[model samples]
Every structure is written in C-alpha cells, then in structure tokens.
Target: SFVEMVDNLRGKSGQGYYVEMTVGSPPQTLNILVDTGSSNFAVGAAPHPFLHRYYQRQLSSTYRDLRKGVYVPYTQGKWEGELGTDLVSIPHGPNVTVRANIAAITESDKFFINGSNWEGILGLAYAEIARPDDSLEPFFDSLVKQTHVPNLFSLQLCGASVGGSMIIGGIDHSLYTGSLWYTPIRREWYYEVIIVRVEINGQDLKMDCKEYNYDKSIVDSGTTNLRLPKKVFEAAVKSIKAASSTEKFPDGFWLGEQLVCWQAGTTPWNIFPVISLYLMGEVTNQSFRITILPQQYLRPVEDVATSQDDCYKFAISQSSTGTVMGAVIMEGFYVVFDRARKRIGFAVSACHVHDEFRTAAVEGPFVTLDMEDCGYN
Candidate 1:
C-alpha cells in the first residue's frame, strides 16, 4: 500500500506544491513536485513563470536556481532547463547531502496541464528511490545506484491525521518484521510488478493470457480499489449490495439497481476477500487489505465503451488504455518496492493499517496465496 497521502495530493496542473530536496553538507533546497505516476526526478527554477505560492513557501534559503542543467522531453511534453545542486533534509534522519543537476523547466506547452497545476516533478520510482550505484550523486537515481540497502520505498498512508510521511531513506523499523518478499524488477526503470496471480473470493480466476492481454493487469498506486477485468469484476460485484436507492451515486460504486452500498460502521456484512498482489521475486504476496464501496455493486450499461464499460459490463469490457490499481486501493497497508533486488513487499500492521484494512484487528500484510505459486497452479 503506497501511503495514500504521498501518492495523491490536492495539487493541480498549473499550481502544485513543490518538494524541496537538499543535496550537500550545507543543504540547498530544490523545488520539485512529488509525482507518483511515473518514477523520475526533475526540478524547476525561478523565472519559471508558473511557480505558485505553495511552492514558494518551501524554497530553501540556499536554493540556487539552475536554468540550464538538462532537458527532458517525453511523449507527453517537453521540459528544458539547467542542472544545479541542493541539500535535502530527510523526513526522519540526518540530512543527505549530494549534488543534482537542477534542471529548470522554464517553457513548454507539452509539459503543462490544468487540473494539477505545478512546476517540475520529482521522480520517485523504485530504482530512483533506492539505487545502489551513485553514492555521491545527489539525485534519487544515483542513490538507487550507489546503495546496498533494500531498493524500495514503502508509503504508510493514513489519511491527513499524521500529515503523512514518505519513507525515502529506507523502511522504518516501526513498520514491519521478518524477511521481505522479493520479485524480479523489469529491466526498464519504470515501476513494474510481476502479476503471477489474481484471486477473487479465495478462488484463482483464469486470465486470457494471449500476448495482447499478457501485461494488462497492473499494481498501480495512483488508482483506487482492485480494478479487475470485466469478467472478474462482474463476479466480485455480486458480493456487494447497495445501501440506499438505485439512484446513481454522486459518490460510491454503481449497482444495477439503486446503488447497493456497504455499511462501514455497524454492519457484520462488511467482510470482503482480501486482494493480494503476487509479485515476481518476493517469497510471498503483498496484500492491499482494504475495503471498497461496501454498498457498491455493478450496474450494467446498454453498451457504452467510452469510459463506463468496466463499471457496467461483465466479462466483455476492456479498459481502453487498460486497467489501473490507483490510489483507492492503496488506502491501507505499507507498499514496499524493492528496486535493488527487483522485488515488492507490503505489511498489514496494527499501527499502520487503516480503518479499511483492519477487519478484526489482525492487520497482516496482504499475503500471496498458495495457488499463485505454481503459475496459478
């Protein structure tokens, strides 16, 4: 479970909070946006023309605006600027001082958005979070390259209560116990988790593993709930019942009739099967033991494939760009991504598990079922 707080922020395309990471003995603050979508680190400098007040508040006194380090242009957009250095104050440890080429993304139409108005992004993907190659290099990519520590960062998201924390340096001793479950990391720096198996109501569902559908399932942190395919999704929805009317919910899941919502506070009917993600190298699974719109149910549509197919149809709907496991599913548990060993690990702890994952007070890390071990045996 990537900490819900770290994964999703209320920041916008044109105005978002910039994270200042210092690199060096005498720290310097580099203003960056904490983006969970793609794992990569970048920064923006003054004369940015788009910097907002929230970003300005976090700027460090030693902050030096580097307007010509390097430029990154993706299929999404183009960003150009220079590289500079800064000192980062670790959330819970001695400050880590290093040098990073702070590239100022000054101007680019492709590099801008509306809803999430913000400057540049600070890429915190698996490898960049824990690299073992560049000890002296100031960027997350370099720390991942130079360290022997577990190449993973676990987010213990607990709403707004604790202001939420990002475990950048390593897993905190207070989080969990025992050895971690390991999986193979896809060679590309992208955040990839091997989906050995997926289960619904304690049964292994067969997947149409044609090359076209092979890599369709994902372990995403930006989405909410366990977003299964139409076939599997249909089966899961049967288990839930709408609480109030068939009236469409401005909130909550959809049911064929009035939305069948689940009761959270005083209902024995609140138990749902634990959704476990069987990673590649880890010895076990990392369970995202959270609840969905309990009163949530599936409502069939006449035949809308635009964007409502997955929610309305069963066994026949396909995610246009494919499905995603977003921030909703990550509401509980601690999602650990071990980039160094190419593995993934999670913990369902008492102190960390949220109201969603704690069914009986025994909050255990989402476990990998035995059936998934032999390739869905």
Candidate 2:
C-alpha cells in the first residue's frame, strides 16, 4: 500500500490514499495527501462536466460517475458530482487497522463542484486554521467525540529507509523512552507558548521576555516551518552564522553582511544543538534537528538603495521574518498531541510519522523520487 511504501522511504515518504468507512465494515481507500498542516476530512466526490478538466481529473476516478449517486453543488458558474468508495484506501499502522466513519457527500449545499479524483483531505492541525478565536475540528475530531475514546492521540511519523509510524490510540514506544515536556498553552487554539529561555550548549541567550508576553508565540502543525521573534531570531541567526559563514546561500542568513568578521571558511557547525523549549514553568531542553539559513545568500532587495540597509535593518518584518520549526524538524521524532491531556511531547526514533520531504527507503508504496528538485535556492 502507499502508506507501507512511504514508511520505507529513507528520509521521506507519503502513502497517498483515499478513505471509506462503513461504520463497522471493511475500510475503503482514497488517494489523499496526508497533511499534518491542515485539519478536516474530505474526499473527492463528483466531477464537473465543463471546467478545469485538468484539475478535476487529477483528483477524480471514473468510479465516481457524474450521471448518478452523488451530485455536487456550486456557488460559482460550475457543476459536478462525486466519486465512489471503491477507489479509496486509508493508510494504517502495523497491527492497527483504522476503521473510519467516513461518509460520502450525497449532495452539496455550498461549493463550486469539480471532478477532483481524491475524495477528501484529513486535517490534523487545529480548526483555528480557518479562525483565530478557536481551532477548527480535526479530521479525527468527529471520531474521537463519537467513539468516546480519549481525545489524546500520538503520531509516530517514520517512513524512510527506516520506516516510522503514526500511532493514534496512544503514545508510540519507538519514539520515546522518558517523560514529556509539559507546558501550558494559551487560551488561544494554536499551540502557543511563552519562550522564557533558550540555552545553546552551555550559553544562555537570556531571551526571557517580560512585557512581550509568552502568549505571542504560536506553534502550528499546519505551518511547515518555525518562526521566532526579532530578539530570539537574531540570536539564533547569530549563533548559526558564527559557526558557519553564508557563502553560496547568503540569503539563508538574515545578517550575512553585518557580521564582517564571519568570513566564509570550512568551520564545522554543531548543528544538532540542544534546543530547549521553556514554556510557562516547565522546561524541555531536548536535542532536535536544526537548519540555519545564512543571510549572505539573500539577494539584494531591488528596493533597498544601499548595502547599509541590510546591515541596519535587522528587525524582523511580519511579512518577511524569522525561523520557523518546520516539518523537517518533526521528520525524525514522534509528536504526541493529546487534546484531552492538553500536552504535546516529542521523542526521536524511527516510526510512523508525517512530513514533507521523503526519506531513503527500501520498498514503499511510492516509487517516485524528488532528490534533485533545484526549484528553490
């Protein structure tokens, strides 16, 4: 299956499939992109007769005929219908068969219908993706509520050369051997936290904010990266830059030119730095993966009149800003999100997990490779 192949990728893999749940019957499948960044479960229903046929065809299979069964509604000047469950397949963990309570969209009251091949998407992040007041319902949200199971769940994302897992019932043993880093999240729906202190090696950067309030920092799974404030971000950039000068990718660093002393050289970087997360009163200083972007590579802004601006303008722009702990950081670890317990934990190991990049694998459900996509610099 796609999930099995994804689990085998050395560094990256994704088992895209569809879903079908007849309450208690055998599970059906759908070719869906398992996204941890968004929450909500939807499938490719019907197809539109005349429209963006390319877009419709990619997500729709012939199983869902427009002439019968499900009829798709539309707000725009478009019309379509949905596909059937025969083409859907939900990925599952070892010895773990997931029984979905998925329902076919018999009809639509709102939405411009298209013949999207895939049936639906499962959103893992908070619903707040749609609103700031509160989080939206998760893909498994309805299931947990109806089944009366603990709202708490763990995802072991490990599909690479060494396959990983995404466990839902409880914690994954392969990822952790000790306790968790407990912190209190704000009333806000996102996994927001108060960064009090950040210590690299043995040096304490003293980033504790008094007036800045800890509630300002939000952790989102949907977002593929980690973002930091100006002060903390600067400190982190400095640490990375001091260790390794930005040569080919000066844009990787925000303060490439400012630090004149940081000449490009073969300086080894202690990359796997001890990234400690001190939230509220709890402190978690675990070793996680860290990638640094040097500023020297940043192309001169066509708008900037002088080189001094790059040196002088060090403040973070809300639009163009700091470090974001993306899915890359989660690729090698097990992330446990227990809504009922209101706790988030991370454990490093090989298992079932979800991430963007594919890892080296043996025999995965997938056969494609993206090792050399130099689209981004």
Candidate 3:
C-alpha cells in the first residue's frame, strides 16, 4: 500500500518542508526535513534539545550501533554521528515499516542556524549521493528493494501554506492536473535534468549549458529559492528591471543574500515577467517548458516584518555551480521523482485538500500506466 503524509512548512529561513515519521520499534514520532539533494538519513544529536525531537538511540530497543562514523555536510551546516540501523515507519495506510540505516548524530555544526523547527533530514535522492562512502543505500531505496513500496514518490508543496502532501509508492491523480511531462534524469546523484534554455517574458536569456558547463540542473524541493549562475542572474535581473521601469513599478532593492524586494503595495504580477524553463523530455525526445508566474517569485519574508509596506522579495539567488530550481519554481507543480524509470515528471498542481493518512494500493508501475490522466495521452 502507498503512504500519503502531510509535509508541513516549518521555518522562515526556508530550510524546506518536513514530514512526521516514527523511528524505532516503539515508534518515536520525529519531524524530518524532506530533501532531494543528498541521500543520507540523519537526526539531530543529543546536544540540541529544542531543535525538534532528537533521536535517543539508547532509548529504542531496536537501535543497533554499527560503530561507524558518518559525516554529512550541506551548504548551510554539517552533521557528524554514528551510523546504525533502526525500524523507520511512516503513516502509509497501514504504517509501512522498514529497517534501514540511520545516522544518530552526536555533533551538529551550524545545521540549526536559526533554531530549527524540525529535528532531522530524510534524504530522498539516489544512493550515488549518499555520505561516508556513497555506497550506503538510502532509506527510500531500501524500502523499494525490500518490496515495502514502489520506486516512486510525488511532492506537492503549496506556497506559503502550512499544508502540502507527499505520496510514496505512486502519484496521486487528485493532487495534479494537466499533462505530467517526464524529463529524463541526466544524473543519478541529484534529480538533475537537461535544461535547454531559460526565458523571461518570452525573451531567451541564452543560458546555454555548454557555455557554463551546467548542462544538468537540479530540481530540488529542499531548496527555498531559484538559484542560477552569475551570468544568468544578471540577465534575468536586467530583463526584470527593464520591464518594471516601463510599467512604473515600485522601487525594489536587494534584501539580504539573494532576495530582491519591493514595498508591500507594489503589484508584482503586473510588471514581473513569466520565467520559463525549457526542459528536454526523454520519452518523447522533445522539449517541454514550465513557466513560473510572478506571484510565485515574490514572497514576504516571514518573522522579519518591516511594517505594512516593508519588503516582498524575489525568491531567487546565485548558485555556485549548476542551476537549482527550488521551491519557488515548484510551488504550483506536481513533481514526481520516478527513480524506477530514471526520470522526473512535472504537471500543474491541483492544490487539492490533502489528508495526513490517505490509503491507496500500488496499481502498477508508473511507466505502464496510462498517461491520459496526465494529458500526455
């Protein structure tokens, strides 16, 4: 049976969404961040008591210490701990349980920058990105290999909403609309895909992959902003500035690291152009474009209110390497990571009301199913 769980919005820092799951035999419910970038399941160590519920290895009878050290590093912080195995269970209709390797961190360095609302991270990426030796299989892969669930999961992240849904084992037809365009995974490490070009207001930004050596872009749900190369960012900003100037848009300024904001009174949609990503489809051997609306780009920074007309910033930044299409670009899209087919699928999100624990059987493999529901047929 497939498991449907509610992935909630946690912080203003944009650490990404988190889901509730029980780890261990007795079942200790801990909120874990859902990440698609790196693969290594880890919980916060015993040091931080306030950062969600930390996993107490000794408390759980099912916990077994492998006596091996694991180190996980991210753009923000790092986690180092002991590697072990435990029975992890998520609310999947009947609560599907799988004994998988998990890192019980004894040291968390800068990971909880602003005091995290979630405890740990549940990486959903491939085993190629796993930590320590990269040979360690992720929890999700183990589940599928053990025949606990199908090799597929769908993510629905509603913008600025506390509610969102993630379906493991299959896609939820009710959560999406239109055609589900399948893009071939260029790499097994990240949910990387081939992005042929990018455009703003129908104007091509000339982001040729060959020129930047960024042929593959990572579509990460764990990221908070749309990240691009320095050159691409300059071009996009230039186009946006040009459009806003002619429309007599309000004066906006760069806020913090990458957010560009205007006063609350400014009508962002009127001047901001639609940003589109031209992705190559492997099955059809054709190109498909996913356009992000202006409303999705402008977001009010949480907790840091600067008054009624303070600042509503652009959810975009500069990337060190390849482009990262983050939550801002994926807010209204139903994304399916089809690991079994080695492809990722995207479609217009339905924004449907999601239940925390919905039950559905695995009808069959996603590739064999009719694409008519996704409008591909």
Best by TM-score: 3
Residue 59, model 2, lDDT: 40
| Window of ten residues with lowest summed lDDT in model 3 | 359-368
The lDDT for every candidate, in the order shown, is 0.42, 0.37, 0.70
Candidate 2 least-lDDT 10 residues = 360-369
What is the Å distance of residue 319 in model 3 from its true position? 1.0
**Model 2 scores what on Cα lDDT?**
0.37
Q: Which RMSD values do the candidates have, in order?
A: 8.9, 13.5, 7.2
- For model 3, how does the per-residue alpha-carbon lDDT over 1-377 read when each residue is reduced to its tens digit? 33235343344435677777789878888878778877899987586745756788878999988889999888768989999999988754225688888998888887764555678888999888898977788989878877656788888878653457778888878777777887788768988776665677778776444332253478887778887767777777778778877644333443224444456656445666777776766544356777777666666565355555534566777677767888877777888999889998888887632223321111111221221122110
lDDT of 2 by residue, 1-377 (tens): 22432332122221222222211123334434344544434443444342231123334332333233322221122123332222222335323323332224433443322332333444555556422112334445555654544565554443232234445556645455444444444432445444444544445666534322322554443232344556666675566445444333345235423322212332222321334433342332322222122221121122233333322212222213223333434444556666766666654435422223422111111111221121112
Give every collision pair in model 3: 179-374
| lDDT score of residue 75 within candidate 3 | 73
lDDT of 2 at 216: 52
Ranking by lDDT: 3, 1, 2
Best by lDDT: 3
Model 3 CA lDDT for position 28: 85
lDDT string, candidate 1, 197-297, tens digits: 54444455555322112334444543323455565455444432232233334423332222233223343323433344444443444433223222221
Report the Cα lDDT for residue 202, model 3: 74
Q: Which residue runs does candidate 2 get wrong by more than 4 Å?
A: 1-28, 31-37, 42-120, 127-137, 158-163, 210-215, 246-249, 252-274, 281-324, 350-377
